Ligand binder design. Structure first.
Ligand SMILES: CCCCCCCCCCCCCCCCCC(=O)OC[C@H](COP(=O)([O-])OCC(O)COP(=O)([O-])OC[C@@H](COC(=O)CCCCCCCCCCCCCCCCC)OC(=O)CCCCCCCCCCCCCCCCC)OC(=O)CCCCCCCCCCCCCCCCC
Ligand SMILES: CCCCCCCCCCCCCCCCCC(=O)OC[C@H](COP(=O)([O-])OCC[N+](C)(C)C)OC(=O)CCCCCCCCCCCCCCCCC
Ligand SMILES: CCCCCCCCCCCCCC(=O)SCCNC(=O)CCNC(=O)[C@@H](O)C(C)(C)COP(=O)(O)O
Ligand code: SF4
Ligand code: SF4
Ligand code: FES
Lengths: 208, 79, 114, 119, 113, 178, 97
């Protein structure tokens, strides 16, 4: 009715809630949380030990048939103990649906790679390792894919600086392309673009 | 097994190793207790044994090869 | 204070993996210097490898040692099949950078950096 | 609960001292009521009428910066009446407020601009 | 008649779709009988396997069977039955009906921080 | 719905005339001859080449070219040092320093825009509340040094004074859309 | 468009298509570079009454996601995430090339 508000269909929410209950009761050993967002997207948060069984079940089940992996990514939230949140978005062409599977890791506990389940996970887990430093067990070839050759540090982490630590320039004395500690002619001006007034009362956290 | 040949060939390798001086080195002298080396120095000595002998020695035997005496009788009962 | 191991149960086979990686790096240094036409000699390349290992040598956590071994294997393999070039190898030596002496008088004469 | 009274902010119970205002109870719960004339170190004025909130089963909205909570009040801070009151008060302020924002020193530090965008 | 092509590259045409589906569903039920009785995966997969086996036995026509099963073509249904059998074996090995292995930290899934 | 790009209906059999047609096609190069013919047709059309620099490619008044600082018809600078252009500048290519002028007006003391950092997106000219900064239609300002693309307030004001006869006309032509 | 009839016939025969009907060079049929000034319409919120922002605040209707089951907080027929996708109908316009 309202031309400025996105229309909402509740049948997708009901279907995804039913499928979330379905997956949660099928796999109680690994599934830690099931939620359906206001956007009608199903998220299932699992233990890191159950990444292989969860992905295999979602790919090979008759009711799931999530044979297409949309993407594989990581989110760095460095306030929790397992700071890397690994997110698997999957697409079911048989049922025209999309699902999200979440798990956690830190800098020193690797999680199982799903190259045996989906083949795009090869390059996607290479990207995740190169950007965040999350190791993957039983990978065919885990190495850097996006950074420079011999790049030291994982740049998509929150504590990594935006400009980095080294910069490249041509030195004529050695006739090479050499790396220097980074110096900027103009420093990146950080902007404090946060209003001191609360925007969304629905997400008001309780006081500590 | 040419015991004297393998013995003085091992001693020649130890003489050729540049980090340690020839004067205090002996057959029964120990790498860290006597010679003041490191485990990395010990595995460099083992790799000198590798490329001067022509046969592989695994990483497991390296922690037992700790004086020239273990080196010479190890090649004695390995060859 | 109990965690899941990566590859090594304790420090012993972690040090074994360290020794194997150092062995293979020591093997590859002359081939690297010969193939990528480095101005350096074989001796100081091996010294560079050794003091990189001694720079990392202070850690005794088996998981951190396993991850350092893994990263060293990636660097070594990247040197085996030549994708890391002469510039990337020569980045280890910092021969184009004037070093900062660590004495208080020199750090006082340069600037405000501690 | 000696010398303490139970009040409710959006249904959530909280102990408050007698004489505690509605705004003080709301910030004890954790919500900052909009304000223009109230300053916690100044005397209570109650003129900007921006802290108007709806009490449950009460037909008239009350000024949270001046009205003390009585007993068992359910303060509906995010109710339709409160939102309409905030919208009307900001409309009345910005009716005669001048279009001086680019030439203003209070560029991003403007409570009026921020509360306009938020309420 | 017989289907000339399946419309998908690398998928062969099965000239005996009813027998293949019957033996695949029977093998799936037989391997599901080794599961524990309280296994929700066993109960659900037995439900779909029994329903699809009943529909296969009911419909002898290939096109009407595909329209009934609504899982693409009958070759795709055969492939899905094969994958369900392999998944049943993997579930039997992994045993996911057990309780939760290890509770997550308190703020592991709290967003925003 | 969907359609097939390579699938063909049923079979066209194997007839002697069809076999002879295929044999003639792959023995006398019929498709090659027809491709040659229509390439000859393009040889006989008219080229689509304009005569640069004597002819210029057509553009629109919306075109985002070289940056410029405009003025009021009185001659006062339109800029009021409000820094929204550098606040919205996605490449952080605008640097502004300001102080009150001798008559107390709110004006800039420094307005630098880096052409080598600018992405020519028009966010400054659409966030400017007084139409001071504009992306005028100049694009033929390639320089031989990197420094000459590091514009300052004097260069931007010179560009605004140079291109005012065209920038104002473009803004007159297009301002009802924005 | 300035081509002679002989060259036009040669081009048409050599390409197999009527080329003068669809010329890729624009000559006069394009719009004028100078246009009359427009008057863009206003949206649905451009009204002086019954237009309170709380009645059309779609940004504030976003809620945190509903927890179906949680490990700390929390005979039926099996379900699917959605009903199975209907088979695509063949094109009635041009099914094959
Ligand atoms: C034999 C054919 C030779 C070419 C010819 O006559 O083409 C004209 C004309 C080209 O056809 P078109 O593509 O329709 O002409 C393009 C425009 O319609 C008409 O073109 P336009 O209107 O843009 O201007 C045309 C104008 C353009 O005028 C010039 O280019 C003058 C240049 C003067 C330089 C001093 O005049 C000509 O092109 C006249 C023909 C000149 C041929 C010169 C051949 C020798 C060149 C020098 C050799 C040394 O030929 C024909 O129509 C029939 C061709 C077969 C004739 C047998
Ligand atoms: C040589 C030819 C040069 C180009 C001539 C003009 C090209 C355009 C002709 C018209 C056209 O597009 O026709 C489409 C048609 C093609 O139509 P088609 O591709 O639909 O196929 C024909 C139909 N079926 C499938 C049944 C075969 O072209 C022809 O029919 C021409 C076929 C080739 C004829 C010549 C064969 C021998 C060529 C080499 C020998 C030397 C010849 C003399 C050379 C003298 C100069 C050196
Ligand atoms: C040509 C130049 C190219 C340079 C390339 C450099 C490659 C760098 C690879 C780095 C690999 C590592 O960092 S793994 C080494 C870290 N391991 C450890 O710290 C384990 C604990 N360390 C120790 O116990 C150390 O004392 C020793 C010396 C390593 C072991 O000897 P101990 O016995 O006394
Ligand atoms: S057009 Fe250039 S100067 Fe203007 S906002 Fe965009 S990037 Fe910045
Ligand atoms: S947005 Fe316009 S008036 Fe404001 S500082 Fe930038 S150029 Fe000046
Ligand atoms: S804050 Fe001004 S009326 Fe209460």
């Amino acid at each position: 009715k309202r031309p400025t508000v996105r229309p909402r269909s509740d049948v997708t929410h009901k279907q995804l809630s039913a499928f979330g209950e379905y997956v949660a009761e099928i796999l109680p050993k690994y599934v830690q949380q099931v939620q359906v967002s206001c956007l009608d997207e199903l998220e299932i948060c699992i233990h890191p030990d159950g990444v292989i069984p969860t992905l295999t079940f979602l790919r090979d089940h008759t009711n799931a048939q999530f044979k297409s992996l949309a993407d594989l990514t990581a989110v760095d939230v460095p306030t929790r103990q397992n700071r890397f949140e690994i997110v698997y978005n999957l697409l079911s062409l048989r049922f025209n649906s999309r699902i999200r599977v979440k798990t956690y890791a830190d800098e020193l506990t690797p999680i199982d790679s799903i190259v045996s389940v989906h083949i795009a996970a090869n390059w996607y887990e290479r990207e995740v390792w190169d950007m965040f430093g999350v190791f993957f067990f039983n990978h065919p070839d885990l190495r850097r894919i996006l950074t420079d050759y011999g790049f030291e540090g994982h740049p998509f982490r929150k504590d990594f600086p935006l400009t980095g630590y080294v910069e490249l320039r041509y030195d004529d004395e050695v006739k090479r392309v050499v790396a220097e500690p980074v110096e900027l002619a103009q420093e990146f001006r950080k902007f404090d673009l946060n209003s001191p007034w609360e925007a969304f009362p629905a997400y008001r956290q309780p006081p500590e | 097994l040419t015991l004297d040949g393998i013995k003085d060939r091992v001693l020649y390798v130890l003489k050729l190793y540049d980090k340690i001086d020839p004067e205090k080195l002996s057959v029964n002298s120990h790498f860290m207790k006597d010679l003041g080396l490191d485990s990395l120095d010990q595995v460099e000595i083992i790799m000198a044994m590798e490329d001067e002998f022509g046969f592989e020695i695994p990483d497991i035997d390296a922690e037992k090869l700790m004086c020239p005496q273990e080196i010479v009788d190890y090649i004695a009962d390995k060859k | 204070t109990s965690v899941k191991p990566i590859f090594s149960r304790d420090l012993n086979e972690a040090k074994r993996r360290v020794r194997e990686l150092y062995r293979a790096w020591y093997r590859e240094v002359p081939n690297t210097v010969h193939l990528m036409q480095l101005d350096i000699t074989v001796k100081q390349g091996r010294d560079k490898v050794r003091e990189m290992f001694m720079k990392n040598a202070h850690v005794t956590d088996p998981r951190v040692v396993d991850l350092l071994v893994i990263k060293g294997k990636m660097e070594l393999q990247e040197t085996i099949k030549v994708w890391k070039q002469r510039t990337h190898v020569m980045r280890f030596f910092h021969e184009t950078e004037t070093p900062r002496p660590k004495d208080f008088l020199s750090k006082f004469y340069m600037g405000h950096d501690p | 609960a000696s010398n303490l009274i139970e009040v409710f902010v959006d249904g959530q119970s909280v102990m408050v001292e007698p004489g505690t205002t509605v705004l003080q109870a709301c910030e004890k719960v954790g919500m900052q009521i909009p304000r223009f004339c109230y300053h916690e170190r100044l005397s209570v004025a109650g003129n900007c009428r921006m802290c108007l909130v709806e009490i449950e089963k009460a037909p008239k909205v009350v000024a949270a910066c001046a009205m003390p909570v009585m007993k068992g009040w359910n303060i509906l801070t995010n109710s339709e009446k409160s939102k309409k009151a905030r919208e009307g008060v900001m409309e009345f302020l910005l009716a005669n407020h001048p279009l001086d924002c680019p030439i203003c020193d209070q560029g991003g530090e403007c409570d009026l601009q921020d509360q306009s965008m938020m309420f | 008649l017989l289907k000339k092509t399946t419309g998908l590259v690398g998928l062969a045409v099965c000239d005996t779709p009813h027998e293949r589906l019957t033996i695949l569903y029977t093998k799936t039920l037989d391997i599901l009988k080794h599961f524990p009785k309280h296994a929700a995966y066993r109960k659900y997969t037995e439900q779909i396997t029994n329903e699809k086996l009943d529909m296969v036995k009911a419909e002898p026509d290939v096109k009407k069977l595909e329209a009934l099963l609504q899982g693409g073509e009958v070759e795709e249904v055969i492939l899905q039955a094969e994958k369900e059998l392999s998944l049943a074996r993997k579930m039997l090995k992994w045993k996911p009906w057990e309780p939760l292995v290890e509770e997550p930290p308190a703020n592991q899934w709290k967003w925003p921080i | 719905t969907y359609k097939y790009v390579n699938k063909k209906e049923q079979e066209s059999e194997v007839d002697m005339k069809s076999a002879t047609d295929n044999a003639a096609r792959i023995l006398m190069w019929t498709e090659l001859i027809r491709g040659l013919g229509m390439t000859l047709s393009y040889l006989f059309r008219e080229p689509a080449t304009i005569n640069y620099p004597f002819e210029k490619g057509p553009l629109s008044p919306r075109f985002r070219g070289e940056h410029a600082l405009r003025r009021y018809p009185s001659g006062e600078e339109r800029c009021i040092a409000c820094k929204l252009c550098e606040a919205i500048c996605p490449a952080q290519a605008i640097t502004i320093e300001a102080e009150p002028r001798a008559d107390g007006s709110r004006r800039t003391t420094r307005y630098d825009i880096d052409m080598t950092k600018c992405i020519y997106c028009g966010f400054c000219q659409e966030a400017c509340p007084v139409d001071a900064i504009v992306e005028g239609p100049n694009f033929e300002f390639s320089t031989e040094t990197h420094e000459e693309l590091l514009y300052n307030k004097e260069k931007l004001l010179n560009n605004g004074d140079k291109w005012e006869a065209e920038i104002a006309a473009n803004i007159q032509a297009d301002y009802l859309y924005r | 468009a300035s081509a002679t009839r002989v060259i036009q016939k040669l081009r048409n025969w050599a390409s197999g298509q009527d080329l003068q009907a669809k010329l890729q060079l624009r000559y006069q049929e394009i719009a004028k570079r100078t246009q009359p000034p427009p008057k863009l319409p206003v949206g649905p919120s451009h009204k002086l009454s019954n237009n309170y922002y709380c009645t059309r605040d779609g940004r504030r209707e976003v809620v945190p996601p509903s927890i179906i089951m949680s490990s700390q907080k929390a005979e039926k027929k099996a379900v699917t995430p959605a009903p199975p996708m209907k088979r695509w109908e063949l094109s009635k316009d041009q099914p094959y090339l």
